[PDB]
Prior knowledge:
The chain has 447 residues and is an alpha/beta fold. The chain has 14 helices and 24 strands. Strands 13-12-11-10-14-19-23-24 form an 8-stranded mixed sheet, with helices on both faces. The chain has a 7-stranded parallel sheet with strand order 4-3-2-1-5-7-9. Strands 16-15-22 form a 3-stranded mixed sheet, with helices on one face. Residues 215-219, 238-239, 310-314, 323-324, 326, 331-332, 334-337, 362-363, 370, 372 line the site of coenzyme A. Residues 272-429 form the Acetyl-CoA hydrolase/transferase C-terminal domain.
Amino acid sequence: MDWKKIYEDRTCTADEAVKSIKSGDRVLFAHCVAEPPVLVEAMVANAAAYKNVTVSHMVTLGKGEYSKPEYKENFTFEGWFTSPSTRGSIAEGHGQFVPVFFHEVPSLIRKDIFHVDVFMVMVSPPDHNGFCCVGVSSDYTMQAIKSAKIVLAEVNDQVPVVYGDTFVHVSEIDKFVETSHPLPEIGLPKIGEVEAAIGKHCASLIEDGSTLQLGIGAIPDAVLSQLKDKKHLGIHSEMISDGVVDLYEAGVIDCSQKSIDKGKMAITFLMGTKRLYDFAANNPKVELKPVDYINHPSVVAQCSKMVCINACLQVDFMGQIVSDSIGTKQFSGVGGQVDFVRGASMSIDGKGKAIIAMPSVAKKKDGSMISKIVPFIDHGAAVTTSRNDADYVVTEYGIAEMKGKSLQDRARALINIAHPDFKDELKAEFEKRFNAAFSAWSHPQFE
Ligand SMILES: CC(C)(COP(=O)(O)OP(=O)(O)OC[C@H]1O[C@@H](n2cnc3c(N)ncnc32)[C@H](O)[C@@H]1OP(=O)(O)O)[C@@H](O)C(=O)NCCC(=O)NCCS
């Protein structure tokens, strides 16, 4: 009745919409696959009208065009998480990066630390009552809507209706630009030998009726392919991808055994191919919720037999875990890695487990092999998951237990799970570091 006039009255072009942004403004984007590409390209196109507009967001599948050097006087990129197309700028010095736990984002917005002048969002078209769906995010996207002084909507009819806190009434949105284009999509990873091995070991720590979290990154997929014998698995996770769909139609994941959000896969956001968005649409077995629910340590602590599984770049001899930087170079963020390490530990049922997984080696550019197991982290790296937070660590060669184990015994476990061709250099490094023989009991048969 009134909502359609409101809608009809606020409909414009991407060009005029981006005129709500003024110099000095903090601008924020909807998360991930809810980033409005037309509303973004419009804003970039009109660069030459802005002076130091902060452009915040997290992981992105767009061109990060605003973070390029040329734009350094119209935009300051201020990432809360980075990705290939925006961490250029943090390295070169004109882009910014803010370390935040993912679950804390909504709060900081409420607090007005992350102040928002213009949130831009992609939502689907209104239903009969005038509620657009974000469909593909919830994360901070819901709080930013309530808190943004101005909200631009890139209404795209390709966006799904997905149950949960995904809804926004047209009355909450200052401008609408109707579009039509496919949503972005990531590639499936190559599940090789190393991938497969990391898989089965994680699969030996998941018991039937486990609830799972599976973070951004390649590795939690080879895991999923190793889970086919599992029964009654449930989901409570930041995100889920195509791998989770396979397991769900293979009858393994059914959430019949959860303590909270019974019968549902509870997620904060979706990223994947179109098979995933289509599956998630109008599906009672999926519910998107805000991150300061999904990622909240207190809430994760309530999950049943929780197995978190995330990835890292390197690990040191104390079990300090580095997941978002290579030396002084910023690469991603904590995102939710720590949120689910904290929550699995606080498990009320006492059964929580967090698994950080990684190949033991990585290739460099000169083609030299390097150990991801190190005496010491790379100069200037950020400790992501601290030694006190550490739990399970997992490579192609095995599992190592960091929880309640001494500095010496952790180093022993990790060396255990390292590429054989590095064990002996790692062993020398042990003895140097700790002023103690690598091998603990000694035999009279020698010296
Ligand atoms: C750990 C993380 C960065 C890995 O993601 P990924 O896409 O699986 O990353 P990769 O293993 O491809 O590593 C990236 C590259 O750096 C290199 N690399 C990895 N570890 C390295 C190390 N210790 N030293 C130097 N280089 C390294 C690899 O060679 C790799 O290949 P490329 O250079 O050919 O592209 C990612 O999962 C992440 O950002 N994690 C933290 C956030 C998190 O856990 N969030 C939960 C939210 S759902």
